[PDB]
Design an enzyme around this catalytic site. Structure first.
Site, short mmCIF file in Angstrom:
data_model
loop_
_atom_site.label_atom_id
_atom_site.label_comp_id
_atom_site.label_asym_id
_atom_site.label_seq_id
_atom_site.Cartn_x
_atom_site.Cartn_y
_atom_site.Cartn_z
N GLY A 114 0.80 -1.20 0.00
CA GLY A 114 0.00 0.00 0.00
C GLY A 114 0.84 1.26 0.00
N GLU A 171 -1.18 1.39 -7.76
CA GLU A 171 -1.18 2.77 -8.21
C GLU A 171 0.25 3.21 -8.47
N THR A 215 -9.38 9.22 8.25
CA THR A 215 -9.42 10.04 7.06
C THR A 215 -10.51 9.63 6.09
N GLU A 239 12.22 -16.23 19.90
CA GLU A 239 12.10 -15.92 21.32
C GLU A 239 11.12 -14.80 21.60
#
Lengths: 64, 90, 47, 429, 426, 440
Positions: free
Chosen positions: F10, F71, F179, F254
């Site tokens: 993204g 995009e 947003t 771990e």
């Protein structure tokens, strides 16, 4: 109507307010510890009498 | 006006009361810093729980109160201007 | 009376006038203080 | 490891915390930058790997134009940016403003910053609290701090040194209601509690020094000269030492009676002390004469029931004990019968440090007596007499009710005073 | 941080809001292009109480200046100080009221309040923590007396906690400017008691009886009279803008001056008032700023309190001395004139200390006196309003504007009783 | 030998792969051409770069990264930036049109032609590394590519590799200021794929990182790029123990061994302690006690939840710089004493420490100060059932009137997920309190 509803609601609010030992007091560890140490000194003096008789017996046995 | 005086008394009482209730939770924390004390503090829990239920209730109630209050002032001044304009027409 | 009679501090906050920077030499000498060259008795066991 | 974290609240907080923290910068060797140009600073200052000495203080106000000046002027880089707490509006001669509404968003940032200093101190002896009953932050927020100070620390030492209002003049009107209702919170939440009155320093500074027409700064210096003798033994060596735990041990016989007085002996000018002998007898005579005290009430109506003495500089234990044995015997002074001995002495080697711009000279001996008495029953009498003279007409009470407050505090804070006004002759008898 | 958003109304409101913003502009060093050419930097610290910020070093006030005809703001735009106000902030109508309450209360006022109530929400919301508002109008016009009372009644409903003060102009009792000026005054006063936090009272023969007798003048303009009521008007917000030992603001004075919300009627004064030829012949000291205040000449109301009682008395001091020698005069005045205070308060005189003096001056003081000498002020309106209304004089100007006679009747009963509320404490 | 292959999905992933990979070129001395001037490193074993970089046939180090977007307008800044020669040209994948705040587009319709090209490049960076510890995922819940396609890439990362480790460090939406509008439909519907096809999972809310850079640092008006820096400091401290020498090393296994008690429970909380500015670094010493207590302070978290409402189940402390094991263990004993921190009744020991000697590296144009010490802490708590509950708050509020759901059906999404994958989240809302309720 709605005014009467608001009135009864405020009445219930005042009821809850008036409704407001089962709770721990703000201060009390003090009192509890006091009573406990008093019981402590009590059993202490008990054992004291016991061992004082013990030592009288002890001085008698030393004489023996 | 009458409903407003009612709201006043109610809200101020509520304020002082839950203030003293938080004061009591504070006494709790103080003594804290035995199991019976734990039980008393759980009692504090349930009590302040009903207390906040009451608080939310009061909030919503006085909200509806001021809402109807605005509605009333609205209609009243509307009709007042109406009367004044009727007088103007005369 | 002449220094009282005849006179840029008109615009002055009292915290600026009454609290200036003192001289570098008026600082107190610590005559009677437990000496710190030997470290003081402190519970350096952290437990 | 001998730390004393100070709390100063208000416009009596910062005008006093400016003067108190000016003396310590010259009592030890501190530049106003913070540096130095043999370890007594560890009570008040803290170290870094650059030699900087940041005080262990908090300055609290609800008004920015008192603390935006100390961060503007001379002693600017000395104080940490976050150690001085400011509001955005002032509580404005009120209680509920300071106690409930405005005091509730400054109760949280302070208790983060008290906890950060107190975690740094290992052997923290206890907090000092200086404030004034005459305002909003000093009397509403300060009793709110001590209502939330006792839960975080319990039996930790918290001393009071308040600016009580003067009995003849006062700066305001509604000021008794803040002065009455602070005592309902500061009885269960105060270990020891000194008093001063600014008219009882106004007359001293013009009589016992030649400086008339002063400011509060010439009153702030003598207040900061008490506090040096309180922490006198913790930093400099002594023949006999005192400590923070020692004052409340020998001046508070009962936990509803924690009200000493304060008196500073050699208050004589930079010239008038330079032409007269100042023996240990001639300073302990001043602290007992009723025209030299830091309160406006004579103990001739009262009974001294505990005492404490502090000493500086050129003191010998022989001449201390020669003038004590006189003032035991004079009948201008009397004690209560149930305190048999009635004293505590403490001797500090280091003589006090002259402040440049002050009004006192280089001296060799000094006394800071803290003698609680029964002549504070004529102090709560006057703060009551003008409170039920003015509660009878409900003269100001509407300011307080609609501010996150209820009415019933007023009708119990006077009835709390009635019990403590009845307490001070049962003990007094 | 703290702001004061400023309201003005009319011909009184703009010939006083032209001189108040002249004294403040000299105080912080503001020339009529906006910029700053002052000396120190105490003159730029708390400037945001009154001035906004713009491109560069420009500081344009928080001023709302309102009238119902622009023949008053044509002058104030075209004075020396007319390029300092932002041009949007004047609000003007077309046809004014002109000495009638109702025309600017319902007909012309109430259709004009819907743009003044936009210029205040665009500008109170710019401020971070606004302290409150001030108003300065007259009770004898039709612009400020009608519509200014309608913005008081309609800004206390949106922001009901922020402060509301009034430098009102109550009628001159002796020689008056307008016949029907009682009608405009007495209907504002009932509209004034329930929606105002604290009220000053500024009369114009109270200014005439100073400048005739104290400054020895024989050409006293209003441009002289507007200095005398802007010397006080900036003498109340001093400690917001300048530091001191002991501070105050507009909130803390009304805390000690409003015992009950029907009781906020002051009468102000001002200490250092002498002639120009009697100027050097007096030492400017502390007792000679407090021998003048309690005298019966300095006050800005036309009402003498020897008949009444000083309920509570305020003070706000300037100059680098109010610490011990003010505290032996405030102790002296509470003892010598011992019958001019009422019993049921501990003490009455409040105190603040600003350390920075007014420019060209060394020391000053300002008075805010809550008294029982205003209940002889509202009785000379309602001894002339009842010498008018029994014969129904001028009434056709009011019933044909949408009012009614009971609204006239109600403003009798709610001001006859407020005198009968004040009258016990004497 | 100890490689870790990042995957960034993204626009949030790519803009974080511009701040993470600027840190790793100053941490190991890589100029933005790729060349390393000095063969020796100041604290490591001359091959410390192998977890992230790889040698080539010009003396040139090329990362182990794949950047994904649907995009071009955010990756063509990378291809013409300063670091245009650092990256291999096929490690930056772009489509031609974006999924556009939608689930079905990026999962079923648009995500299907970038599912194949990426798995050609994943299997090339995962065949070069002989010792791959596990992938890393940097995605965003509220997008189309970071939610539709990431859930498509997790679902096919399961079968192609099996029980390999995969971690996601995702951006959950903020509780107050998001947003978007149709972010809660995407944010809920990917919460299945972070529970089945995920091994560990952290959450950052940008509203919470705004609260730090405004307060602790003195950047009024920050940007996303004063937030992408602080997420690189968490990631580097997690894998600092792989690269540089230390007293106690902690691998990526771990982590999972010590703070993941149950396989439905893998949502801890990332916190990084000494976030201060170089005008407030001058004032305070930065000892081990002053940096291990500030992680427990709830104002310093990187998510909008408070662990005073929750029971701490396990923890993971990571220490960088000038720390001794004497003082790490000294200040752990203090936080046990206080009653503000409460552990669950079945985790009596409850800790794990990792000590790395290498102090963290400061960046030019950066914002923090160069400090001797640091702490990154990952504690998982029963204080996540309040973060999930502020998104059932706003999924059902919107889905009750069936508002936006026409966008999703016609792109290939059946109507089952709008009733299932919230009740899928109902169980993991209910699991977390039962696994933190006291014994009977």
């Amino acid at each position: 109507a709605a005014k009467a509803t608001s009135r009864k609601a405020h009445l219930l609010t005042d009821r809850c307010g008036q409704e407001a030992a089962r709770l721990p007091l703000p201060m009390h560890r003090d009192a509890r510890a006091q009573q406990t140490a008093e019981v402590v000194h009590a059993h202490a003096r008990g054992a004291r009498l016991t061992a004082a008789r013990l030592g009288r017996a002890q001085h008698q046995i030393n004489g023996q | 006006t009458m409903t407003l005086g009612l709201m006043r008394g109610t809200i101020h009482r509520c304020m002082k009361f839950n203030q003293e209730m938080y004061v009591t939770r504070g006494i709790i924390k103080g003594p804290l810093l035995a199991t019976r004390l734990a039980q008393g503090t759980d009692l504090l829990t349930r009590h302040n729980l009903h207390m906040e239920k009451n608080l939310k209730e009061l909030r919503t109630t006085h909200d509806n109160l001021a809402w109807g209050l605005n509605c009333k002032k609205i209609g009243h001044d509307v009709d007042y201007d109406v009367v004044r304009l009727r007088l103007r027409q005369r | 009376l002449q220094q009282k009679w005849l006179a840029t501090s008109l615009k002055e906050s009292i915290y600026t006038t009454s609290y200036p920077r003192l001289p570098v030499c008026a600082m107190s000498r610590r005559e009677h203080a437990i000496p710190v060259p030997h470290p003081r008795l402190q519970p350096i066991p952290r437990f | 490891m001998r730390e004393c974290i100070s709390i100063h609240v208000g416009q009596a907080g910062v005008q006093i915390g400016n003067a108190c923290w000016e003396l310590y910068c010259l009592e030890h060797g501190i530049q106003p930058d913070g540096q130095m140009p043999d370890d007594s600073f560890n009570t008040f200052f803290s170290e870094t790997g650059a030699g900087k000495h940041v005080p262990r203080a908090v300055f609290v106000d609800l008004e920015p134009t008192v603390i935006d000046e100390v961060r503007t002027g001379t002693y600017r880089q000395l104080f940490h940016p976050e150690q001085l707490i400011t509001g955005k509006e002032d509580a404005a001669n009120n209680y509920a403003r300071g106690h409930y509404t405005i005091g509730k968003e400054i109760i949280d940032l302070v208790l983060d910053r008290i906890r950060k200093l107190a975690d740094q101190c290992t052997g923290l002896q206890g907090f000092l609290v200086f404030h004034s009953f005459g305002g909003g932050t000093g009397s509403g927020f300060t009793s709110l701090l001590m209502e939330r100070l006792s839960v975080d620390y319990g039996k930790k030492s918290k001393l009071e040194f308040s600016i009580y209002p003067a009995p003849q003049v006062s700066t305001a009107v509604v000021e008794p209601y803040n002065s009455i209702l602070t005592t309902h919170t500061t009885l269960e939440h105060s270990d020891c509690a000194f008093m001063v009155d600014n008219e009882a320093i106004y007359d001293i500074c013009r009589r016992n020094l030649d400086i008339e027409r002063p400011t509060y700064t010439n009153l702030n210096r003598l207040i900061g000269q008490i506090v040096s003798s309180i922490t006198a033994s913790l930093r400099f060596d002594g023949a006999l030492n005192v400590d923070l735990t020692e004052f409340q041990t020998n001046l508070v016989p009962y936990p509803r009676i924690h009200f000493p007085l304060a008196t500073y002996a050699p208050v004589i000018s930079a010239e008038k002390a330079y032409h007269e002998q100042l023996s240990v007898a001639e300073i302990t005579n001043a602290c007992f004469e009723p025209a030299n005290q830091m309160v406006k009430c004579d103990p001739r109506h009262g009974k001294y029931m505990a005492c404490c003495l502090l000493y500086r500089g050129d003191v010998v234990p022989k001449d201390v004990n020669a003038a004590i044995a006189t003032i035991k015997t004079k009948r201008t002074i009397q004690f209560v019968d149930w305190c048999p001995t009635g004293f505590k002495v403490g001797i500090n080697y280091q003589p006090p440090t002259v402040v440049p711009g002050g009004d006192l000279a280089k001296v060799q001996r000094a006394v800071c007596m803290l003698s609680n008495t029964t002549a504070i029953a004529e102090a709560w009498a006057r703060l009551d007499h003008k409170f039920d003279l003015m509660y009878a007409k409900r003269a100001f009470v509407h300011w307080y009710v609609g501010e996150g407050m209820e009415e019933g505090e007023f009708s119990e804070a006077r009835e709390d005073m009635a019990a403590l006004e009845k307490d001070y002759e049962e003990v007094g008898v | 941080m703290r702001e004061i958003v400023h309201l003005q109304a009319g011909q009184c409101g703009n010939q006083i809001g032209a001189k108040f913003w002249e004294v403040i502009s000299d105080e912080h060093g503001i020339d009529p292009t906006g910029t700053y050419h002052g000396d120190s930097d105490l003159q730029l610290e708390r400037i945001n109480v009154y001035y906004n910020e713009a491109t560069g070093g420009k500081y344009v006030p928080r001023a709302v200046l309102v009238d119902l005809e622009p023949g008053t703001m044509d002058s104030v735009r075209s004075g020396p100080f007319g390029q300092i106000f932002r041009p949007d902030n004047f609000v003007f109508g077309q046809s004014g009221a002109g000495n009638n309450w109702a025309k600017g209360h319902y007909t012309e006022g109430a259709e004009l309040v819907d743009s003044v109530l936009d210029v205040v929400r665009k500008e109170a919301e710019s401020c971070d923590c606004l302290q409150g508002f001030q108003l300065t109008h007259s009770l004898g016009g039709g612009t400020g007396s009608g519509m200014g009372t309608l913005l008081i009644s309609k800004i206390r409903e949106e922001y009901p906690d922020r402060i509301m003060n009034t430098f009102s102009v109550v009628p001159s009792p002796k020689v008056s400017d307008t016949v029907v000026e009682p009608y405009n005054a007495t209907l504002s006063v009932h509209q004034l008691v329930e929606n105002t936090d604290e009220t000053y009272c500024i009369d114009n023969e109270a200014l005439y009886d100073i400048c005739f007798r104290t400054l020895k003048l024989t050409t006293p303009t209003y441009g002289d009279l507007n200095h005398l009521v802007s010397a006080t008007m900036s003498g109340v917000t001093t400690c917001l803008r300048f530091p001191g030992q002991l501070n105050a603001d507009l909130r803390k004075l009304a805390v000690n001056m409003v015992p009950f919300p029907r009781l906020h009627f002051f009468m102000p004064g001002f200490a250092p008032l002498t002639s120009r030829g009697s100027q050097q012949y007096r030492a400017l000291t502390v007792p000679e700023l407090t021998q003048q205040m309690f005298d019966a000449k300095n006050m800005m109301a036309a009402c003498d309190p020897r008949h009444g009682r000083y309920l509570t008395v305020a003070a706000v001091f300037r100059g680098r001395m109010s610490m011990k020698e003010v505290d032996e005069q405030m102790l002296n005045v509470q003892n010598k004139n011992s019958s001019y205070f009422v019993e049921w308060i501990p003490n009455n005189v409040k105190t603040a200390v600003c350390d920075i003096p007014p420019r060209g001056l060394k020391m000053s003081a300002t008075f805010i006196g809550n008294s029982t000498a205003i209940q002889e002020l509202f009785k000379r309106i309602s001894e002339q309003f009842t010498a008018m209304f029994r014969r129904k004089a001028f009434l056709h100007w009011y019933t044909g504007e949408g009012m009614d006679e009971m609204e006239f009747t109600e403003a009798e009963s709610n001001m006859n009783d407020l005198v009968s509320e004040y009258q016990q404490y004497q």
